[PDB]
């Protein structure tokens, strides 16, 4: 179906400690495949997925050069942003950056992304047309005007429509069996008394890929938003994912609840119930 490539950048100023930190990770779908950390011994882009290790030395050397320059550019961006917001030279601040492409089943660009957050809030983003920018506040409008004059959106559109899709297609061919692969979750319901009158039912989905899943509790056939606790999908640590959904029910009424599970790897949607 649909596939995506994404790069995630974090630059953190630490004026009281010395140099800022720059970290980059790259993902294809939900699979991390590269990383760079300015805080390593000698910083280098490194493989994080088995299908990328076949790239030759020119790949890692070229990309390492890019991250080192990105780290330098970001340090100056952080100094500019500190001026725009009239912020104290004393404290630590964060610039996050997130760009990449989504392609359709035929490999055609569905959407490109290129957006920034400063201190955890939206700052500026390339619009869906890849020709204009949305600025989140007056400070971001300084960047917007500067980047309009620089023709900055045309440079990024060209990467998003050209090389981004082209590298994505190549990664998808290089890592086809797994990058592609669709692994269904193994599922089960647990039951844990909270008190004499209430119990928790927990629906588990374990070991699935990709990370997209729906896990819902239905009481008498109607779903229980407002009362279902739903933890973030969490990594198993082996490139698969886990998720559970919990509902507090009156003891004696457990069997009025069903957990509905839909995942790409499941031949048919699953309806699961507590089984004593």
């Amino acid at each position: 179906g649909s596939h995506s490539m994404r790069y995630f950048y974090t630059s953190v100023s630490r004026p009281g400690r010395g140099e800022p930190r720059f970290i980059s990770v790259g993902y294809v779908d939900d699979t991390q495949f590269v990383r760079f950390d300015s805080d390593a011994a000698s910083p280098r882009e490194e493989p994080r997925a088995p299908w990328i290790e076949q790239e030759g030395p020119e790949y890692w050397d070229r990309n390492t050069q890019i991250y080192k320059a990105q780290a330098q550019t970001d340090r100056e961006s952080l100094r500019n942003l500190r001026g725009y917001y009239n912020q104290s030279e004393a404290g630590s601040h964060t610039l996050q950056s997130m760009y990449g492409c989504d392609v359709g089943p035929d490999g055609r660009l569905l959407r490109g992304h290129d957006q920034y957050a400063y201190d955890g809030k939206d700052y500026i983003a390339l619009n869906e047309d890849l020709r204009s920018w949305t600025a989140a506040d007056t400070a971001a409008q300084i960047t917007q005007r500067k980047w309009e004059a620089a023709r900055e959106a045309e440079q990024r559109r060209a990467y998003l429509e050209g090389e981004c899709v082209e590298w994505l297609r190549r990664y998808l061919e290089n890592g086809k069996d797994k990058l592609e692969r669709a692994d269904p979750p193994k599922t089960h319901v647990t039951h844990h008394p909270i008190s004499d009158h209430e119990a928790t039912l927990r629906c588990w989905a374990l070991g699935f890929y990709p990370a997209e899943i729906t896990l819902t509790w239905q009481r008498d056939g109607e779903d229980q938003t407002q009362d279902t606790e739903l933890v973030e999908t969490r990594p198993a640590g082996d490139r698969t994912f886990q998720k559970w959904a919990a509902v507090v029910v009156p003891s004696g009424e457990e069997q009025r609840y069903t957990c509905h599970v839909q995942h790409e790897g499941l031949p048919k949607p699953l309806t699961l119930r507590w089984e004593p």
Partner: peptide
């Protein structure tokens, strides 16, 4: 492969 975003914010 990443794209360098050279021009400052």
């Amino acid at each position: 492969s990443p794209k360098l975003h050279f021009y400052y914010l």
